[PDB]
Amino acid sequence: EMEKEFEQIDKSGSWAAIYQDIRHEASDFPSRVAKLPKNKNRNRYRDVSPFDHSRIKLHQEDNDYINASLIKMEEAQRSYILTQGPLPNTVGHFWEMVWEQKSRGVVMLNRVMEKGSLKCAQYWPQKEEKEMIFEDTNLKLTLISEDIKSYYTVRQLELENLTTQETREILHFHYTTWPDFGVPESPASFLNFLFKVRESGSLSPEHGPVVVHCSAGIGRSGTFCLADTCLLLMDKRKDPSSVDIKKVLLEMRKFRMGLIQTADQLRFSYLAVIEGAKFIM
Template identity: 60%
Template sequence: MNLGVEAEFREIEEKQWSVFFQELDVISNNLPFKHAKLPENKGRNRYREVSPFDHSRVRLQAGTNDYINASLVIIKEARRKYILTQGPLPSTCGHFWQMVWEQRSFGVVMLNRIIELGSVKCTQYWPPSEIKELEFRDTGFKLTLIKEDEKANCIIRHLELENTKTQEARHVIHFHYTAWPDFGPPENPTSFLSFILFVRVSGCLSEDKGPLVVHCSAGIGRSGVFCLVDTCLLLMTTRKDPYSVCVRDVLLEMRKYRMDLVQTPQQLRFAYVAILEGVKPILRSLAIQQSPVMRSLDPFGRMAPKWVHGHHVPFEGVSSWRSQEPMTDSDEEDAPFTFRTSSPPQSPHWL
């Protein structure tokens, strides 16, 4: 298979991932982050060495201090916008939900557990199931747990976020991936790819919604892996030539918006493995479509291309990444991918 990503992967395997990772660090942008180091903002950072760049930091709109450790990452070709942020501190939970409200975000992705290896990685910023409600009086927001759906490798929470000053309320979906091990990345990408698909089919990445909020503990390691895998798989679906996608270039573009995205060589290798597994159904379908009859239909051989919220709907052959029914209601650091869900989809809705 003459696949650019596979060629990249094999070349790096021969070179060693640690060497390749160091080369990436050397050429990654080193942009200013003066606001993060201001005395009044230091207490809002979970880690001293992880700061948002000044040019891409998210600014809080209400209140006397607009600082939050969060970065807006924009990938224009993929038409993707993500907000990557740290796991909230006890003093910044209200700021976190203020940001979600002001940015009109519909979804929050959490890639860590509250406690890992005996250390607190994130404050619980949503209501526990026995309480159902939390109020953040410092920023004027109230959060209510409407529904919690626990799956094998993730928990999907439906929340109501209310602005107590205006009494306006919005629905927010919280996607909590619980299968990332304490040591290193997952052994295989199956559950991670399934989790990305859960997020996609919810509608949270639709262009008519605000940016998807993604966090782990520092907001650079696992968060970077999530955005890199999602973006590369999307580009491989929408480009005329899926072989032209270069993971290295996509990561370097993302690092222009938030420092050190994808934090370790092991995480980067896992991202490549996940992309290679996730793209297999697309390439198998593409190969089928290259017959003389199918080539006459369109550049990808798709029999019935559609667009949903600005994204291509793959044709029926893309089984593992086929459209799904929308669901209604400091980071630590390969098996074939088969997507399965406990609830089979009813109708197409690729995002």
């Protein structure tokens, strides 16, 4: 059981060592499309690339490339798109992906500015009366409502396909309190946030996969999916203690490289799952 494994690693301070074994066991697949010279300005970080086999393709004939990966967790019935924070030139591609994949929710785990640098383009409208038009992808986005709480903001957005005049409602879940350095002290507000996303229906199989991002789409984004999948597997299995976080993480790393960036994010993932299990047993 992971509570006991947690105490072992913690008491022994072996987190950097566990983390290194995961790094060494992790899959490595080609990412040829990401490294094409015509795609250089579609990537925020040169060392963070989607694998060719799991990459999301845009339905535009010119250039189908976006830095985004489909994570498919077959047993858990869960699929996630993990992507980078959009760039000024890819905001239109981002919303095209949301449209094409029939996603109901966008989960954002960063602030637009952190450590005095921009981590993400402002890709949603700040006021009801000032909608955004993405000329390159023929989409219109309107802020319908905004509910600001202490730890997160939920926004209702209307996305309109200007080509066909279909409209969809998108929910934007914005976790606003992840600190500039390190991880939250307690996982309570992160779990609250994860249960709010679940309650919305955004993670349900009726819809396309949820879009999850931070800056690179691997660190905080990774913690989100790992905690959700682990808690789901503990509800589904005859023996909840047969859930090995390390085996789940390695499975997700077949779909996108570098999920969980630091030994601290790994420790935080254990703590989130351990604490979330109490609200689930």
